[PDB]
Nucleic acid binder design. Structure first.
Ligand SMILES: Nc1ncnc2c1ncn2[C@@H]1O[C@H](COP(=O)(O)OP(=O)(O)OP(=O)(O)O)[C@@H](O)[C@H]1O
Ligand SMILES: Nc1ncnc2c1ncn2[C@@H]1O[C@H](COP(=O)(O)OP(=O)(O)OP(=O)(O)O)[C@@H](O)[C@H]1O
Ligand SMILES: Nc1ncnc2c1ncn2[C@@H]1O[C@H](COP(=O)(O)OP(=O)(O)OP(=O)(O)O)[C@@H](O)[C@H]1O
Ligand SMILES: [Mg+2]
Ligand SMILES: [Mg+2]
Ligand SMILES: [Mg+2]
Lengths: 54, 362, 97, 433, 606
DNA sequence: GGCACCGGCAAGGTCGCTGTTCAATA
DNA sequence: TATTGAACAGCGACCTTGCCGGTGCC
């Protein structure tokens, strides 16, 4: 049947992390932007904690 | 392997079901009840209203309280559909020109709260067009809380041309309470308002010629339908039947400055590129619960023909399923093989945060 | 005094020169191609989805044979109903006034 | 870092103009919201949007822009830009729970880029930032001239922009993304003037042609070319204001412009001896008024447009106090004077990169005639005409340029910071050109 | 000359802000080669079928361990509605008319029927030249036929009748000498059957007097087998009338007086073989939105006729009041291309019978079938005397009583001779029927049905046999909309014999064996067929048209000793009761998907 | 020489159309 | 024993893409 078909067509379905771990969590944080005259100002920006690897 | 879930959430009734099916499994009021001095959703919240304050988390088509909205999705997956979202991709519908920030917040919630593996946000008017079987047209979409007119050409909606008539199915219920109070009844409390909503759905209709109707209503016996309340008392309603829907065509009748749905349609077509207009007149599509009154198709055919040039051919498309067209179109879209290339995967969300919805759900 | 030194003129000018010659140029190509792609995706998708929406109404050989079978099922059931009601001698009417 | 997502900077981009005002976010091919600059006024409150302009007792139609394409009504400007940038593009606050019938500063995250006409004066520029920094709590601000953004919307760093707007026709040379000041040339011979030509021409056919705007007809029946109209009119319990009828007639004039009027594109001016005589012999164009009244138009369809190319052709102004257009206000004179504002070595480069903009440039034949006139007045040079836009939809050119500008990474160093403003106040004349 | 160290000390420094070169969206193309779709691929996914699987499974569980008294069977009609429970022997029959207060009666709004120019050049203009010549030729043909059939004819006959009729003059009796006492409806009296509005239906509507203190008008929502748009100001008013009539039939004939209880009942609705899809989708909506019945099911009149009979295969000729229809049924379907639908029936025989006698100086020249007592008189006279039996014809004398409202009863003697056979015989030359206004208003309020996705394509049924009969009246690149509009402009009319053979040839589709089975299987139904010797006469007319079939032709009236009016109803009741019928649209389906679920559920291609 | 528009072509699977064979009914 | 509901096998029509190529800009 078509949903079982291997190769390129179903590359999305086989990639699903069904019943997997929690995704990382996002918070509205703040980023510092600098003008060409050196002045600093703040924009709200999405942020999340890093993803380490030993 | 399991199908994606399709969620069509609105100002009145939320609808939910499986991609591929031709109708939703769950249809329930978008009401959240809280104890005033635990929480409850849908018919359960209406059944025990005495110990609760009720709110709607969606107002004029747009989510306005997220803490309450998340209780509706929780109820939808675990109490209505009986499925765990972490097994399924999700399709959410979205109002025409709702704010950017809302797309980010609904994205945030279905990943971080419900762990769904992949998801997509979709413009309600475009889905309702797919469900009518065409690529190009203008959708008059009219729900409980808002009415929109949306031109779409080759499957792309035209944001600059969208015109929002901010009056809809609740206003026509309130207006019908008001004019029934003038006939000597009384319907002031919520327990009566839910009766008056049912009275629209059974008895109201759109006049073909309002002047002829409101003149001949003086003599007509046939017009005066009777209806039995829960208390067994019988009301009778007469010219109230068509005066209530007429407010779509004359928003002065319920006291606001706006064009009626025929004029807002016409104006929205006329804001489009000159070459496209001939195609839009040939493809006027009706969507949403408020478009369900008998006669509305005909009055829209007439009223837009009166505004358009004599050389145009004007066509109203109003398919029988139109109350759920927005959900049906989502079912179609989520059940094509190509949907797999469209959706945001949880792996993209992890990489990109909620802003990914601006890149992919274009 | 601010915003009038020869250096301020130079930096402002240089920013806008690079911005116009390099960045505007690349982003215009990307914007136009991106739009073309987006419009194509939506055209394709609208075509598939609109076909599917109508597909249920198209007649088929298989659907026609199933429907002929349902009609024949009911027709034999009706004949069996008349076998039973004949073999048990169904009566009907009295018309006194 | 790796703590941030796909998010960068969500600029708002705002483009006021005499006929229409445009707003939306950067990084999109079109503005989300476009409304008539003509606001409504009733019972002491202002009303916005083409869905709201409707017949009511005492309804008066007003515009916050003057025909210099500049703001002349900053109080109304404030309310119109609050309606766009706040009420239609931000999350709504919810109703109180008691009111719903069940129970018995705004812009702090979006910088604003705003569009000015190129002759907009220092005091008007100052008041634009003063309004913004007081009213909405915006983080940072930028103001830029329509010619620059039209050039960016065609992908050109150096260009000659011809910009045939509503209240004004403009020509300007853009080089390395900045306007060459000496080159700026401006003229009334534009979309609004062209409506005056059309009205004059209608009031001077053999039977006079009367325009009755869409709202005054309830119902109509089709009738033959040149026949008397067949319709029945609305009647109102109040006087319709002259201002309202004048705005609701403008839609009918816009249909005639977009679908009947044609620039004479042929060899030489329309009044040259053979051209006018030939034009009367051609197949015409059909048109209908909201009245149902129908007619075929032949030689007039050229003459209403021809006036902006040759002043000799123009009909008498229907307003008797309006000044008639001079030679120096015709499109060829503007172009010739504009280029004579610029160094001779730079002219071939500009002429190779002509960018056309504004809805009056969408007249049938306008690009043809502009190509011919440029050819005959600058022989021996390559002429090439570009539209401003990412799409066939060419109406929003100067907005689109802002949406591209506000999306470039190198641009964000430019915004005048809330802090940078509150320390200085008059920074915007200097830290912007 | 420029330098970075000066700019650093001035506080000027060009900066990327850590941003990407551009934040314009970059879009990847979708790939569609060999795409597939899961939309409505399985019965599990289609709501109408999901619900049926659940219902079947529940009934199997109930077997491991529905009631006909809760099923209502409705069959609408241009004069009569049959309604009853599926439990029952027989339906109750009531006239499908609704009576209400109004400013003017039927009689006061229109010209008299049968149509006459009361001012004009003698009888020839008064009745119309062609009509009078038709009548003359038919009379001659009958005399020739009787003589050829070796039966007596008096050389003069009309002159014995006409001179009696025009000289008789009526007699008045009722104050003193005992008549049948008619009883006019007491319109002032309140309804007892559970409602406030003083509307009337059925026989109690027809017996409202022409003058009463509140003035009353009668409305018929069905005529000639279709929705009666000619008589109605607006669509909404017509839907409200059909709803009021059926509502009052449930309360007044079935006795289902409490509106709350109706949600327990289910409904079988019979429809014609060539339905208007707007009429089907109206009847579904009445039964589910207004009456809120639990389930609705449909069956075609000819399909149902065979279920009443217990026939596997038949040709069903259905002679109504105003419609006549023919189709062939085999293997559990009406054969889609066989369907024929002619716009005449037993009412036209009544009008024509009155009009023929009027021309022959019938005493009551003031008669006008829009007046209620006149209509009832004309129908009674029709049913008493109209006769296709050729042998019993003679000069005969009879009498009738005009019990007009609030006037002493007038008695008329009269004579007839051949009006009694020539008016019925109009089925074999329909040019004598007053077909002049049947087509008036036929798209006035309700449009032709179009496909829901492609609104320039008609979706009403079509049949080769019907188009063959249109071509027979009016010999017949444009759009399907324009072609349908041209066909709509011709009234379908043909001789009855020719219509049958035309139906059967398209049924067989060029196969003499299929013809030779169907032609031996003619089944006649419908009230218009109840005229004496109708079936033998129809057989004889086919035999003398097709010698190649003449020994095999067999025409049977009714089935299994039923009355010809009820066979269709009985059939629809058997379809209700039998176990295998999954054809029901449930209330929950129609609330969800409207008329879309009919296409999923019927036992034919809708 | 890189990259692009436009075109004819070879090719992949899903889908409906055609057909054989089987277990089961009565 | 004739007929049925169903699983299974086989084939062509169809839409869509990548490929090789002519012609062209830069
Ligand atoms: N048959 C009917 N006739 C008239 N009105 C109806 C009918 N059925 C439903 N409605 C009305 O439709 C409205 C609900 O429409 P819908 O479900 O489309 O609301 P919604 O989608 O939640 O609204 P929105 O999309 O605006 O948020 C209600 O006012 C309801 O009373
Ligand atoms: N399709 C069209 N063809 C020609 N003219 C048009 C068309 N559509 C609109 N117009 C006219 O062109 C003008 C449109 O406004 P436009 O965007 O060109 O100017 P603007 O930028 O709003 O005003 P400003 O003159 O201040 O720049 C109006 O005068 C309008 O009547
Ligand atoms: N005993 C009878 N003998 C002869 N004709 C009769 C008799 N009883 C009724 N009729 C005639 O039969 C006609 C047909 O009645 P029937 O109920 O079959 O028509 P209908 O189904 O109500 O209407 P339609 O024409 O739409 O089918 C009546 O209109 C009447 O003229
Ligand atoms: Mg909705
Ligand atoms: Mg402008
Ligand atoms: Mg009948």
């Amino acid at each position: 049947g078509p949903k079982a078909n291997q190769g390129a067509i179903n590359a999305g379905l086989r990639a699903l992390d069904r019943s997997g771990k929690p995704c990382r969590k996002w918070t509205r944080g703040t980023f510092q932007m600098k003008s060409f005259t050196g002045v600093v100002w703040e924009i709200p920006r999405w942020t999340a904690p890093p993803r380490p690897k030993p | 392997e399991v199908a994606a879930l399709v969620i069509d959430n609105g100002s009145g009734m939320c609808k939910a079901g499986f991609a591929g099916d031709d109708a939703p499994r769950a249809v329930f009021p978008s009401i959240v009840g809280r104890p005033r001095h635990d929480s409850y959703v849908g018919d359960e919240a209406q059944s025990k209203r005495g110990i609760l304050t009720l709110r709607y988390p969606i107002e004029h088509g747009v989510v306005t309280n997220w803490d309450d909205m998340e209780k509706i999705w929780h109820h939808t997956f675990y109490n209505e559909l009986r499925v765990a979202p972490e097994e399924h991709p999700v399709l959410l519908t979205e109002a025409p020109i709702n704010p950017k920030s809302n797309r980010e917040k609904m994205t945030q919630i279905v990943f971080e709260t419900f762990n769904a593996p992949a998801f997509y946000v979709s413009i309600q008017a475009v889905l309702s067009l797919y469900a009518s079987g065409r690529t190009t047209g203008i959708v008059l979409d009219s729900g409980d809380g808002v009415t929109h007119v949306v031109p779409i050409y080759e499957g792309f909606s035209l944001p600059h041309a969208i015109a929002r008539l901010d009056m809809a199915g609740r206003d026509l219920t309130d207006y019908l309470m008001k004019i029934l109070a003038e006939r000597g009844y009384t319907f002031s409390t919520t327990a009566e308002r839910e009766i008056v909503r049912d009275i629209k759905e059974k008895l109201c209709y759109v006049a073909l010629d309002f002047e002829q109707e409101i003149q001949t209503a003086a003599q007509s016996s046939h017009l005066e339908k009777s209806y039995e309340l829960p208390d067994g008392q019988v009301i009778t309603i007469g010219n109230e039947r068509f005066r209530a829907p007429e407010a779509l065509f004359q928003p002065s009748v319920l006291g606001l400055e706006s064009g009626g749905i025929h004029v807002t349609t016409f104006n929205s077509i006329m804001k489009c590129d000159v070459d496209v207009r001939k195609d839009l007149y040939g493809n006027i599509v009706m969507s949403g619960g408020t478009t369900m009154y008998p006669g509305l198709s005909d009055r829209m055919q007439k009223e837009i023909t009166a505004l358009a040039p004599s050389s145009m051919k004007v066509k109203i498309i109003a398919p029988p399923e139109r109350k759920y067209s927005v959900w049906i179109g989502g079912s179609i879209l989520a059940s094509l093989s190509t949907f797999q290339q469209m959706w945001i995967s949880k792996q993209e969300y992890d990489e990109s945060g909620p802003s990914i919805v601006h890149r992919k759900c274009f | 005094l601010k915003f009038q030194s020869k250096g301020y003129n130079q930096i402002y000018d240089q920013i806008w020169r690079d911005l116009a010659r390099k960045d505007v140029s690349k982003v215009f190509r990307l914007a136009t191609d991106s739009y073309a792609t987006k419009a194509s995706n939506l055209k394709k998708t609208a075509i598939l989805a609109s076909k599917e929406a109508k597909r249920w109404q198209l007649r088929t050989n298989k659907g026609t044979k199933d429907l002929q079978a349902r009609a024949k099922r009911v027709m034999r059931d009706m004949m069996g109903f008349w076998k039973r009601n004949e073999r048990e001698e169904r009566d009907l009417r009295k018309a006194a006034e | 870092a790796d703590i941030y997502g796909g998010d960068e900077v969500s600029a708002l981009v705002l483009d006021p103009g005499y006929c229409n005002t445009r707003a939306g976010f950067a990084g999109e091919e079109m503005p989300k919201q476009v409304i008539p600059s003509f606001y409504g006024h009733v019972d002491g409150r202002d009303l916005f949007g083409d869905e709201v302009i409707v017949p009511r007792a005492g309804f008066e139609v007003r515009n916050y822009m003057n025909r210099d394409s500049m703001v002349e009504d900053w109080d109304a400007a404030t309310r119109v830009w609050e309606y766009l940038l706040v009420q239609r593009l931000q999350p709504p606050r919810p109703t109180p729970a008691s009111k719903n019938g069940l129970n018995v500063k705004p812009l702090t995250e979006n910088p604003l880029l705003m569009t000015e006409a190129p002759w907009n004066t220092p005091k008007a520029r100052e008041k634009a930032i003063e309004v913004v920094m007081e009213n909405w709590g915006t983080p940072a601000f930028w103001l830029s001239r329509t010619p620059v953004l039209a050039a960016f919307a065609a992908g050109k760093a150096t260009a000659l922009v011809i910009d045939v707007g509503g209240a004004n026709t403009s020509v300007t040379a853009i080089h390395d993304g900045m306007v060459l000041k000496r080159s700026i040339q401006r003229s009334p011979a534009a979309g609004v003037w062209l409506s005056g030509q059309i009205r004059s021409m209608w009031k001077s056919q053999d039977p006079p042609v009367n325009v009755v705007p869409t709202f005054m007809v309830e119902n109509k029946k089709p009738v033959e070319a040149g026949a008397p109209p067949d319709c029945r009119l609305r009647n109102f319990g109040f006087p319709i204001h002259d201002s309202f009828r004048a705005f609701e007639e403008e839609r009918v004039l816009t249909e005639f412009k977009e679908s009947v009027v044609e620039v004479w594109r042929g060899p030489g001016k329309y009044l040259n001896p053979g051209n006018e005589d030939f034009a009367k012999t051609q197949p015409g164009r059909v048109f209908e008024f909201p009245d149902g009244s129908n007619q075929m138009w032949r030689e007039q369809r050229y003459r209403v447009a021809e006036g902006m190319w040759d002043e000799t052709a123009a009909y008498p102004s229907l307003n008797p106090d309006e000044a008639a257009i001079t030679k120096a206000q015709t499109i060829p004179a503007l172009i010739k004077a504009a280029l004579d504002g610029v160094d001779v070595d730079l002219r071939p480069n500009l002429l190779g990169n002509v960018v056309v903009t504004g809805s009056t440039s969408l007249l049938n034949g306008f690009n043809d005639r502009l190509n011919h006139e440029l050819t005959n007045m600058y022989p021996g040079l390559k002429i090439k005409l570009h539209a401003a836009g990412l799409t066939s939809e060419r109406r929003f050119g100067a907005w689109i340029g802002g949406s591209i500008l506000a999306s470039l990474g190198t641009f964000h160093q430019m915004w005048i910071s809330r802090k940078e403003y509150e320390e200085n106040g008059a920074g915007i004349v200097e830290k912007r050109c | 000359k420029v330098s970075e160290r000066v700019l650093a000390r001035e506080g000027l420094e060009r900066t990327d802000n850590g941003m990407r070169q551009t934040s314009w969206p970059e879009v990847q193309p979708i790939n569609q080669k060999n795409y597939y779709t899961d939309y409505m691929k399985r019965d599990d996914q289609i709501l109408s079928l999901r619900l049926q699987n659940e219902a079947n499974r529940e009934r199997l569980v109930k077997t491991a361990q529905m009631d006909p008294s809760k099923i209502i069977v409705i069959h609408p009609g241009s004069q009569n509605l049959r309604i009853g429970f599926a439990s029952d022997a027989l339906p109750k029959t009531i006239p499908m008319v609704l009576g209400t207060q109004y400013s003017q009666t039927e009689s006061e709004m229109h010209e008299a029927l049968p149509r006459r120019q009361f001012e004009g050049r003698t009888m020839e203009q008064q009745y119309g030249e062609e009509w009078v010549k038709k009548y003359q030729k038919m009379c001659s043909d009958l005399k020739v036929t009787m003589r050829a059939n070796k039966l007596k004819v008096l050389p003069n006959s009309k002159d014995l009748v006409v001179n009696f009729n025009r000289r008789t003059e009526p007699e008045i009796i009722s104050q003193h000498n005992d008549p049948l006492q008619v009883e006019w409806t007491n319109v002032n009296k309140a309804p007892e059957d559970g409602t406030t509005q003083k509307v009337f239906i059925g026989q109690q509507a027809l017996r409202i007097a022409e003058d009463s203190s509140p003035k009353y008008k009668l409305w018929w929502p069905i005529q000639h087998g279709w929705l009666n748009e000619d008589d109605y100001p607006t669509r909404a008013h017509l839907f409200d009338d059909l709803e009021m009539l059926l509502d009052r039939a449930l309360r007044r004939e079935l006795g289902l007086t409490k509106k709350a209880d109706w949600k327990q009942y289910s409904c079988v609705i019979v429809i014609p073989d060539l339905y208007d899809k707007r009429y089907v989708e109206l009847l579904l909506h009445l039964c589910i939105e207004f009456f809120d019945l639990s389930r609705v099911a449909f069956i075609q009149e000819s399909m149902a006729a065979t279920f009443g009979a217990g026939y596997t295969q038949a040709c069903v000729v259905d002679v109504g009041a105003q419609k006549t229809s023919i189709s062939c049924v085999e293997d559990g379907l009406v054969i889609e291309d066989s369907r024929v639908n002619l716009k005449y029936g037993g009412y036209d025989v009544t009008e024509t019978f009155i009009k023929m006698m009027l021309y022959d100086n019938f005493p009551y020249q003031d008669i006008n079938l829009r007046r209620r007592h006149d209509f009832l008189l004309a129908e009674e006279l029709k049913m008493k005397y109209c006769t296709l039996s050729q042998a019993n014809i003679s000069v005969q004398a009879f009498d009738f009583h005009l019990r007009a409202p609030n006037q002493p009863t007038r008695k008329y003697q009269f004579k007839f001779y051949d009006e009694v056979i020539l008016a019925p015989m109009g089925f074999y030359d329909p040019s004598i029927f007053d077909n002049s206004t049947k087509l008036r208003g036929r798209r006035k309020l309700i449009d032709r049905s179009y496909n829901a996705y492609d609104v320039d394509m008609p979706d009403d049924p079509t049949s080769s046999a019907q188009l063959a009969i249109l071509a027979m009246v009016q010999p017949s690149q444009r759009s399907a909309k324009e072609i349908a509009a041209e066909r709509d402009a011709v009234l379908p009319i043909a001789p009855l014999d020719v219509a049958i053979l035309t139906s059967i040839q398209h049924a067989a589709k060029g196969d003499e064996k299929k013809v030779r089975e169907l032609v031996g299987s003619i089944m006649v139904v419908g009230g218009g067929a109840k005229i004496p010797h109708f079936a033998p006469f129809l057989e004889e007319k086919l035999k003398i048209r097709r010698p190649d079939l003449a020994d095999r032709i067999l025409v049977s009236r009714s089935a299994r000793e039923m009355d010809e009016q009820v066979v269709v109803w009985k059939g629809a009741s058997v379809f209700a009761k039998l176990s295998t019928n999954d054809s029901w649209v449930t209330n929950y389906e129609y609330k969800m998907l409207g008329s879309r679920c009919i296409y999923m559920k019927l036992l034919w291609h809708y």
